[PDB]
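Usage example:
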Amino acid sequence: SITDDFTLTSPYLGFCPYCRHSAPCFSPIKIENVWDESDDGSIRIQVSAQF
Amino acid sequence: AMNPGAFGDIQASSLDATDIVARTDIRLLKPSVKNIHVPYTQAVSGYEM
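Running the assembly step on the lines above writes:
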């Protein structure tokens, strides 16, 4: 049951080891995974904020 | 028969099959920082190798 009803889903604060101030913090934007298997160089980034 | 860090590290009968088996060496570690996360060390993906 894959949905597109994004109105009832929520962005979250992620915890990541590198920040603006070069120390781990809780950022609204947090890279969970990065996928790089396209043949042109495009990468897919999963971020903790809804875009 | 599933060696870690080499070919056949994760296996299944089909791509969409829910019977997925693997023996990649995942080791979960005690968190050394006063936050929440799951620190883990894993063997390199044997498909990539």
